[PDB]
Design brief:
The PDB classes it as hydrolase. The structure is a homotetramer. Chain A has helices spanning about 10-20, 25-45, 50-65, 200-210, 225-235, 255-270, 300-310, and strands at about 70-75, 80, 85-100, 110-115, 135-145, 150-155, 155-165, 170-175, 185, 220, 240, 270-275, 295. An eight-stranded mixed β-sheet of chain A has the order 2-1-3-4-5-6-7-8, with helices on both faces. In chain A, strands 10-9-11-13-12 form a five-stranded mixed β-sheet, with helices on both faces. Chain A has two domains: about 1-175, Fructose-1,6-Bisphosphatase, Chain A, domain 1 (2-Layer Sandwich), CATH 3.30.540.10; about 175-310, D-Maltodextrin-Binding Protein, domain 2. Chain A has seven helices and 13 strands. The first copy, chain A, is α+β, with helices and mostly antiparallel strands and about 325 residues long. The interface between A and B is large, with 50 and 50 residues. The complex binds magnesium ion (4 copies).
Chain lengths: ~325, ~325, ~325, ~325
Amino acid sequence: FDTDISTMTRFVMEEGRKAGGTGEMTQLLNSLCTAVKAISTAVRKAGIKLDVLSNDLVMNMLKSSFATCVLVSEEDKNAIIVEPEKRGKYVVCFDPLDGSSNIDCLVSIGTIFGIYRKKSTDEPSTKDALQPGRNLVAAGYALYGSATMLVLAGGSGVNSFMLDPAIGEFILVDKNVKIKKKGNIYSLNEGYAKDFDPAVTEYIQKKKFPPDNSSPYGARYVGSMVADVHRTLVYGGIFLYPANKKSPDGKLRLLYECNPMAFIMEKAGGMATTGKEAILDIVPTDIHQRAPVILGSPDDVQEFLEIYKKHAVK
Amino acid sequence: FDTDISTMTRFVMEEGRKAGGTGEMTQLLNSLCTAVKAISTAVRKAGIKLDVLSNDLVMNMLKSSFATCVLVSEEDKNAIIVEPEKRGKYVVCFDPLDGSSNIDCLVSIGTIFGIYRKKSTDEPSTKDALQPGRNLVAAGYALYGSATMLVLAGGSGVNSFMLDPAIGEFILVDKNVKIKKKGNIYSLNEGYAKDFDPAVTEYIQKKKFPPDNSSPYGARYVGSMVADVHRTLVYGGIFLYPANKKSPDGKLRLLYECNPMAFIMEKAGGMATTGKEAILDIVPTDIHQRAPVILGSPDDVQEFLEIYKKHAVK
Amino acid sequence: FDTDISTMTRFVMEEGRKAGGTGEMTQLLNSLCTAVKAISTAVRKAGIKLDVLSNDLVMNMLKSSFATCVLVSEEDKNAIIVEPEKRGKYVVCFDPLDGSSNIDCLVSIGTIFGIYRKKSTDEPSTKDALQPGRNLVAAGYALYGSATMLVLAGGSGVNSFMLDPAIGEFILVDKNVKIKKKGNIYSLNEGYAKDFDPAVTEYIQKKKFPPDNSSPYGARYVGSMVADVHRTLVYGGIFLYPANKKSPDGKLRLLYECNPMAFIMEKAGGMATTGKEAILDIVPTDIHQRAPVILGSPDDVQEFLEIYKKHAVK
Amino acid sequence: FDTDISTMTRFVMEEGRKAGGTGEMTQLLNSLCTAVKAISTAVRKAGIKLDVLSNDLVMNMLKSSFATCVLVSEEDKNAIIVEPEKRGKYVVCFDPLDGSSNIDCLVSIGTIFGIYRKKSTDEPSTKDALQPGRNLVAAGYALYGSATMLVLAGGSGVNSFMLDPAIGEFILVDKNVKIKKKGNIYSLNEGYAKDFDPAVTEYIQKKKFPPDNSSPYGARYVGSMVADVHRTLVYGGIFLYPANKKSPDGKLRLLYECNPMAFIMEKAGGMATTGKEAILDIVPTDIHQRAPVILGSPDDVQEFLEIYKKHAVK
Ligand SMILES: [Mg+2]
Ligand SMILES: [Mg+2]
Ligand SMILES: [Mg+2]
Ligand SMILES: [Mg+2]
């Protein structure tokens, strides 16, 4: 066995010692890890709804952290104001179990969260949760796959942690990851080819028949956001979830879905945009607001952006 | 805890009692399950090559089963003749760790196997492994995902088993599964759109702009065969791995990749073909021979087949 | 000869003048009658496939009616969208030649159709054909027997028309028919006695050994749906096509087989159910969907229903 | 002046060309518009009863349309059977001049109508007017305010038309309107606070002191149904007319008041319910039957519904 275990806690603990945290973020992240480990377990045996189980699990651990004041979940109509006695300084937006639809086919589902520091001195309210993604102080997700992973983006980089099931701790596996500058994979559901705007139809076209005669990009789309975004972070490329008829503003939620993934992308060196603007700069008006997202290696989203404006004729 | 555990072993044991097996198949399948459980473990922590580890693991457990005589692996140039003392009546073709390429992105990789009964009275040789897929007596795969699954197709149906990590046994989860008649998902790497033959280009086209004005099929492609084939078995639809420039005969291997998946499809009520002929009817000439594969719900591969012949102009 | 001929056309023409039709239904029904008359002829001499001939015949006459937009046939994998120029407001579901299997033994085969008014303002699609039977505006069948009959159920009753071969017109023969309240004949293939659920086994039993010591019902089963359903409408009784092993959801199709016959039954004063629910209330998900059917005189299907629930133990 | 005028007639004329109408609906709607324009005029100068004038006006224009057979007015004890010579296929329910009580204070009063297609082949009778709101083929109202508006809900959406007094035509102003998902205004006469059931008292309470500390909803109640419902459709929010002591079943009439407004709400993307059930699903027993109504943005009536059942303890 190893005598010096590099656990996530040790890591967030060092990090917090720089800025001089009170340690709340550590309580927050520890509580979160407990919820994630419980979910990985439910998932690894749920066969021999989980959605509500996961929501409650994450909600309860978060509250017991004494580190939060406002909880916004994909699973809740309204924002949650944490009791005064368990109150703390952070606002956390989360999607307890994402990809919960195609869950049977074992397609890598996951948990997504974004953490903001409350700014107003007054009583907590939904307003605290309506901050632009650029205001996030931490963000990440857990991918429940062959192994349970937790990717975390602090204000100093992206680090990948893998759950060691023998001791139930997330061990640092990759430190300060950077997304490659240009990738060879594009990802999106081409089954909606019929509703795609001309910009996307053109961009895709340039992928299958490159004009400089290079090898065309390969296609890859899992169907679960956390899965597609993770492959993107890891091997590079681009991920697209534009608007169509069935979802004229995109299908992915802004607060607890696009923002946390946008923040991780930038910290990783990638980019995240709506075509018009960067996801992190969008100021939210509603906690369940959606947004179109194009994200990935910088050289590919930029190439996308040119084609976007060539058609914006602004 | 449950007092009556429905383990895979109990199941293959009942099944074997019908035909009146000597019990070799049970030894074979038990040895296999041990190898799979060891691999799920290596995988769940391989981060904090596996290919060769897995090959050796599966090879060794198979030999110790006293149930086999000829082993054909994706990882081996030639077929393996099992020692006389450990010799048994079955020939097993396998792919120890498939999807071993995009393994980092947690995209559901797996193990694939096909089991044949030796027919010739003479000394074992490669010839024993060169039988048409229709001659298989058992087949299945293990999907290493959120949970480790083992799908098995005996001569009586397809059953899904999920690994209970607490006791290390595969518990029967789904009995005699049937693939839906028609699905709404199509799966293939459209990044090779440029090399696709007219039949596929047309079929795909009919998917994105249905002529009867129905809703178009959704796209889904994980990149790992076992993953894509499993989602197909589960939610229905179609999976396509045709030939192109880089692979003019298809990329998937016949013996230990297409055949086992073709056999499971048929037993599930689906179909598996090359366009010209059914995968199970192809008589192999080489153990590493490849084949183009179209497989899935019957109503979709048939629809594909019409378009195939409309272009075959035979 | 008669100076005042009571033809079907005159009849649908009067009827249409009530509701104030544009006359499309008349064009539709006239085109249909032409197809039926051509088929009766092919049949009356087919000896000295017809299926495909009949499908094309009915398809072509329907399109030329300028009264339809979506055609669903038993003979077609998908629904048919009628050309814009020949487009009209109705959706018609049909089974061109039913009983086409035991056709040699002269056992009364026939054509079945159901007519729906399109509801959506948008482009025609399969969805227009997926309406519950209770939405039918007209329905009927043609029985090709000793005489060619056409039974039609408008929203005002059931009328029987017989083809006068001398002038090639269907003359009204029976106006507003009503099925008797209770009949003395039961109809179903008892050769599947082995797969029958306990409810049916009990019901049949009460038929051969009536508990009130009355005379037992006679048995009658032609093998051709249109034939059995017609004898039922005429002399009363009950017709049963439940589910078994070979057909766990029933063998008869919902859209163009059970629905049109269910609608006629109700309009005739009879009932049509699956055991659980009335056939007309089932909302279709697929154009080739099947359904178990019990239909006939009200006093008999009700008696059946009691025994059904006595075993449902819901 | 504009060379291409987008009049309501042109619009209902295009729409009718889809379904293939005989043109009756156009005659119907044109006759209606004439009655509305005459009323807007009487109203714009009635100062320098109107109720009976309006009833007669609408009754006469409707009859001259040759498009109706049964007329049900708020102003008439019984239903009206239209003469055979002027008879047509539609049944129209209407409230000629609503809000006719607080008319002096200039509070936006209006005309409300609902149109049904007759179904029975027999002689017209009151029964034709007793169909559930979900059976409506068209519905709308005219708001006589700063401008005269006509809101129409066809089976394809809601469109707002404004009367151009210079040429006396209703010009399309807003196409296919959608009610916002959640609004910030609640509307009801709180002066009956004393008779309100606990569900409403609680819901209102959650509006003035939001539990998630958000800004409380503003109050707005004009006193005239058409006015309150129109502001609701336009800016979103919720409208409530529950039952009390003075009106234990609600005050608004079902046929020509709640149904037409319920149909418009749904077509607009909103909802309309009694607390127990949706207004459109209520099958009428009497032409002057009343119903409690809660209607508006979906996110608000749903929030209401939860509180309704939390108190139904069903
Ligand atoms: Mg989600
Ligand atoms: Mg392989
Ligand atoms: Mg048939
Ligand atoms: Mg009124």
